Amino acid sequence: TDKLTSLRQYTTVVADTGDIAAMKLYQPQDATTNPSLILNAAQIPEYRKLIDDAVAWAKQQSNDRAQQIVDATDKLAVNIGLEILKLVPGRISTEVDARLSYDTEASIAKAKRLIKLYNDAGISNDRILIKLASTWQGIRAAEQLEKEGINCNLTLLFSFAQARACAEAGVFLISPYVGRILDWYKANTDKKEYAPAEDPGVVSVSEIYQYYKEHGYETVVMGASFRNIGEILELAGCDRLTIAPTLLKELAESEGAIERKLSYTGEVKARPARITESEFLWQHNQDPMAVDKLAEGIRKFAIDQEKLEKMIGDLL
Amino acid sequence: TDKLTSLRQYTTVVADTGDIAAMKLYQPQDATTNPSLILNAAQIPEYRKLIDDAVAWAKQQSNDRAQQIVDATDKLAVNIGLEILKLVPGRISTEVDARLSYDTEASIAKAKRLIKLYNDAGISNDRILIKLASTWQGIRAAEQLEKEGINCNLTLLFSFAQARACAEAGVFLISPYVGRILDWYKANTDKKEYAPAEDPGVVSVSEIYQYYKEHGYETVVMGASFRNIGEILELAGCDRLTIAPTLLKELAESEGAIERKLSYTGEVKARPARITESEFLWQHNQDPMAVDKLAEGIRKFAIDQEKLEKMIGDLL
């Protein structure tokens, strides 16, 4: 009779954390990590063994400091994923170095590298999503990766242009953001408080969901980034939702059955011509929130990557 | 002496307006327009004849409403430039439709169309700068246009990535912004008052100027967008400065000689490899001010274009 159980009737619940304790507690279907969560998880004293294993593995691959830093940081992200895969039945999402976000070729190469590490550790591609920021270059990377049997999670998705381009690329899953949209609207408009159905992040995911189902797209819609439980409840029915442990706790502690809020009913429509790069860039840049937040999210994940490299470099 | 006269010892002063009254009063070397200035100038009652000519001309070109709207708006922008060219000895800058800012081929086509209108009116390319927003697509357009003998003014220039890419493309002139940079820093930091030398717009143009001269680039540096005369005076020595009539008046009314503040002295250096598109996108998006203000400036000019089209449409 708790809201977490009630939500699971309608939506596949995913845990947004690198902490295996959350996997044991909430028993989610999938888990998501990102570079900030990898850096946070690396602070868990109990994860020191995973760091040491990554460093030891890196030193067996080469005798070069620069490559050891890359190898150990990549292997740490994979090692955390491997621990999570022992505790969930579904996917792990592991994000590529955000510094590659505007480089399609380098992103494809990094995705293949991470897939190789997982495969060599005995994990098949059907358990992995490689996460890429949904810039044009990331979307193009993902389209190629899918053609080669690597499933992707297209993240930092803010504008309708991003949503459309991801669907047209046939990516496995999108992670459209909710809470960071609320943040932007509180900072940049005169409306400082929002009821759940008014929340602009909730509106964004709801509109994306409608567009996807109305055109028969099979890309999984997974809402991500949450500030409060109200946002999550308003999206009950979303294919998946990835939720941080603090809000999983709030759902589990809240009594009362909930209703499905997000559904599609209608006549499925023909698809348009694919959006071109120029049209995509025009339309993405019409959305000042998305302009700001996509670029910002990439910068922040890049800073976390640099912090991971410093941590690793100090151990070599 | 007065500060305008003194400034002119060091810098070519350009008038930032579509109003011929300013050209008569200040006798500038060049003039700049943009879509906002064209909309404002089109609304001057004494300019109605220029609108009527543009509409009359458009109706000679086709019997199609949609094409007449485009033809009349383009011809109006050129007609205003033609009036200004009677009153200045140097260049007119005329900006392409900002809705084309992420479309290289459409931007090249529009630039060539505007050049044809000027040429057919008896004006040679050596009197014209076609103005383009300095997105990657605009810079690529300009690189091609320059090779075909069309000189360009690369505008809405905020990041170092934009500055470098413009120099490497061999564009005739850049218009790096000053005042809009100050605006962003006031809005996004706790510092709202700056000494002239610490004004972040002044710092931007000064750094761009240094980079250009240090590497022997011949692209003209023309500071643009001003909030106060202190900004202008701190850039005395910039190749050109384009200044609104309100600030030209303030300079003319301010007594006293000023010193040259912006100069290059040093050993000219070898150039790097050209910045790639991916490196450019990464580096531009490292600059949150530039991310916001480039996209914003394009949106605003596109709205002005739409308002112009509404004005013209009502007259067909």
Report the CATH number that the domain containing residue A185 is assigned in CATH. 3.20.20.70
Give chain A as a 3 state SS string: CEHHHHHCCCCEEEEECCCHHHHHHHCCCEEECCHHHHHHHCCCHHHHHHHHHHHHHHHHHCCCHHHHHHHHHHHHHHHHHHHHHCCCCCCEEEECCHHHCCCHHHHHHHHHHHHHHHHHCCCCHHHEEEEEECCHHHHHHHHHHHHCCCCEEEEEECCHHHHHHHHHCCCCEEEEECHHHHHHHHHHCCCCCCCHHHCHHHHHHHHHHHHHHHCCCCCEEEEECCCCHHHHHHCCCCCEEEECHHHHHHHHHCECCCCCCCCCCCCCCCCCCCCCHHHHHHHHHCCHHHHHHHHHHHHHHHHHHHHHHHHHHCCC
* Chain B residue whose CA is closest to A102: B278
* Chain A residue whose CA is closest to B302: A286
Kindly state the tokens that stand for A6: 């009630």
Marked catalytic residue, from B3, B75, B110, B131: B131
Identify the three-state secondary structure at position B92: strand
Identify the three-state secondary structure at position B257: coil
| Total domains in the fold of chain A | 1
Checking DSSP bridges between strand A152-157 and strand A173-176, what pairing results, if any?
A: parallel
Please tell me which of the candidates A135, A288, A299 has its beta carbon nearest to residue B286.
A299
Q: Is B250 exposed, middle or buried (0-12, 13-18, 19+ CB in 10 A)?
A: middle
Q: What is the C-alpha separation between B143 and B141, in angstroms, rounded?
A: 5
- Within chain B, strands assigned E span 12-16, 30-32, 92-95, 128-133, 152-157, 173-176, 220-223, 240-243
- From B7's Cα to the closest Cα of chain A, the distance in A is 38
Identify the three-state secondary structure at position B207: helix
Helix (H) or strand (E) holding B113: helix B104-120
Paired strand residues for B174:
B154, B221
A217 vs A155, A167, A213, A220, A233, CA distance in Å? 17, 6, 6, 9, 24
Q: Is A49 exposed, middle or buried (0-12, 13-18, 19+ CB in 10 A)?
A: exposed
* Chain B residue whose CA is closest to A295: B285
Question: Quick one: which of A87, A83, A93 has its CA closest to A27?
Answer: A87
A214 vs A98, A210, A280, B274, CA distance in Å? 32, 6, 20, 45
Q: Would you call A298 and B288 a contact, using CB atoms and an 8 Å cutoff?
A: no
Contact A123, A82 (CB under 8 A): yes
A189 vs A170, A192, A226, A288, B291, CA distance in Å? 34, 7, 19, 12, 19
Q: What is the C-alpha separation between A34 and A95, in angstroms, rounded?
A: 5
Residue B218 CB contacts under 8 Å (≥ 6 apart), including other chains: none
* Chain A residue whose CA is closest to B281: A102
Q: What is the C-alpha separation between A235 and A257, in angstroms, rounded?
A: 15
Kindly state the tokens that stand for A201: 């992040």
Question: Quick one: which of A126, A87, A128 has its CA closest to A111?
Answer: A128
Kindly state the tokens that stand for B253: 């009314």
Q: What is the C-alpha separation between B120 and B116, in angstroms, rounded?
A: 6
Please tell me which of the candidates B102, B286, B288 has its beta carbon nearest to residue A282.
B102
Contact B253, B31 (CB under 8 A): no
Question: Could you give the angle at the alpha carbon of A34 between the alpha carbons of B280 and B283, nearest 5°?
Answer: 10
Q: What is the C-alpha separation between B281 and A133, in angstroms, rounded?
A: 14
Interhelix angle B200-214/B160-168, nearest 10 degrees: 30
Marked catalytic residue, from A75, A131, A213, A293: A131
Please tell me which of the candidates B104, B292, B299 has its beta carbon nearest to residue A292.
B292
Residue A259 CB contacts under 8 Å (≥ 6 apart), including other chains: A236
CB pairs under 8 A between A and B: 50
Q: Show the domain range for B46.
A: 1-316
Q: Is A291 on the interface with B (CB under 8 A)?
A: yes
Contact A183, A230 (CB under 8 A): no
Tell me, yes or no, if A131 is annotated catalytic: yes
B282 vs A4, A106, B136, B162, B175, CA distance in Å? 40, 13, 12, 11, 22
Residues 112-171 of B with CB under 8 A from A: 135, 137
> Tokens 């000042």 sit at which residue?
A288
Q: Is A281 on the interface with B (CB under 8 A)?
A: yes
For this experimental structure, what is the resolution in angstroms? 1.4
Q: What is the C-alpha separation between B178 and B175, in angstroms, rounded?
A: 9
Q: Is A101 on the interface with B (CB under 8 A)?
A: yes
Return the DSSP state at B276.
P
Q: What is the C-alpha separation between B175 and B188, in angstroms, rounded?
A: 23
Q: Is B281 on the interface with A (CB under 8 A)?
A: yes
Contact A232, A247 (CB under 8 A): yes
Please tell me which of the candidates A103, A288, A299 has its beta carbon nearest to residue B295.
A288
Compute the half-sphere exposure of residue A278: CA atoms within 13 Å on the CB side of its CA. 12
Q: Is B188 on the interface with A (CB under 8 A)?
A: no
C-alpha dihedral, B101 to B103 to B105 to B109, nearest 10°: -40
How many other CB atoms are found less than 10 A from the CB of residue B253?
A: 11
- Biggest distance spanned by C-alpha atoms of chain A: 60
Residue A61 CB contacts under 8 Å (≥ 6 apart), including other chains: A67, A68, A71
Contact B166, B139 (CB under 8 A): yes
> Tokens 């694919």 sit at which residue?
A274
